[PDB]
């Protein structure tokens, strides 16, 4: 079996590996990739997503979101209270001022115990899923706007045509913008570029030890566990990597610099947070190896988790008999 350990696996194809993604994936699953949870692409020397980002200034952020955590420094949750919109060139200019800059630091590991030690103590702001891309139309490797579809995937393996779409999102972040604890829509594939600016780090459990991160959720969230038997989907939920430590949780962690790709595996929760100002893209995708997680991801139908269209069609086909409840969730 390969990589039994599930370390974070790190690749650097070249140009022609860069061309079929699709196969790309699945050698890097061959070489157990995927038993990690989240592995690093770094693309070829020869790549890149566009010519420059010197006019992203004008995109807009609807509804930035202050993060406002509750708890003690290494199990909290935090929620997201609506601002005001700004433009990026705005958010660019908030995410760099006194109170919202990264502090001096020695290195990436200075910083992550700050992140840690400090976090729950400040409320930074985001841009999060704004439906968009900043991949030129001409990048033809690894376009994250011109991947195969989701259901055009479900189409192919089972034969059945569905409605909706799978556009991707774009991120705006600054120092201690935050990612819960979750595993994607449907236990589905991600993939995050981050186009430009400071790094991201990682924190992901290996799929095949997903149920011990859930166990000690719902342990340190009595009350979440209590109101929804899947509340790691609404995705508020922190816990560092010194409780997971103490309490025997294997995970790993990686940090992402700008020009770099992430993709996470099906049932591989992740968590973390930004060090300055970033913007990322990320799409969800699928493979035919994501069909039988699909089929048995959990749900939450208490209403908080909320997600777009094109869920609907995922639940319906492959797990009927969770439809109504659901669906009931939604509405
Ligand atoms: O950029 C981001 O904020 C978050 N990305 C992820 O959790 C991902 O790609 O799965
Ligand atoms: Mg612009
Ligand atoms: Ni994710
Ligand atoms: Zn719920």
Not at 36 to 44: E, Q, S, V
Not at 47 to 64: Q, V
Not at 124 to 142: C, H, R, V
Request: hydrophobic residues 35%.
């Amino acid at each position: 079996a390969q990589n039994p350990n599930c370390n974070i696996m790190i690749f650097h194809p070249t140009k022609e590996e860069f061309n079929d993604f699709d196969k790309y994936i699945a050698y890097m699953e061959s070489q157990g990739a995927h038993r990690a949870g989240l592995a690093k692409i770094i693309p070829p020397k020869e790549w890149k997503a566009r010519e420059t980002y010197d006019n992203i200034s004008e995109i807009l952020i609807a509804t930035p979101l202050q993060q406002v955590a509750s708890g003690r420094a290494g199990v909290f949750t935090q929620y997201h209270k609506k601002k005001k919109a700004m433009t990026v060139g705005e958010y660019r200019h908030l995410a760099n001022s006194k109170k919202y800059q990264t502090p001096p630091h020695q290195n990436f590991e200075d910083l992550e115990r700050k992140y840690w030690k400090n976090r729950i103590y400040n409320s930074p702001i985001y841009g999060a899923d704004i439906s968009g891309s900043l991949f030129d139309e001409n990048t033809k490797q690894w376009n994250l706007g011109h991947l195969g579809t989701i259901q055009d995937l479900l189409e192919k393996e089972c034969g059945v045509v569905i409605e909706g779409v799978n556009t991707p999102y774009l991120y705006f972040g600054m120092w201690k913008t935050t990612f819960a604890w979750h595993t994607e829509d449907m236990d589905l594939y991600s993939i995050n570029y981050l186009h430009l600016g400071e790094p991201k780090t990682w924190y992901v459990v290996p799929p095949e030890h997903g149920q011990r991160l859930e166990r000690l959720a719902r342990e340190l969230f009595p009350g979440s566990s209590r109101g929804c038997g899947a509340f790691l989907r609404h995705k508020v939920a922190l816990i560092s990597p010194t409780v997971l430590k103490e309490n025997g949780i294997p995970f790993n962690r990686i940090t992402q610099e700008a020009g770099e790709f992430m993709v996470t595996f099906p049932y591989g929760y992740h968590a973390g947070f930004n060090h300055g100002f970033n913007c990322a893209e990320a799409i969800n995708f699928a493979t035919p190896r994501w069909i039988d997680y699909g089929k048995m991801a959990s749900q939450c139908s208490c209403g908080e988790a909320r997600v777009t269209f094109s869920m609907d069609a995922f639940v319906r086909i492959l797990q009927p008999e969770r439809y109504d409840l659901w669906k009931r969730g939604q509405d």
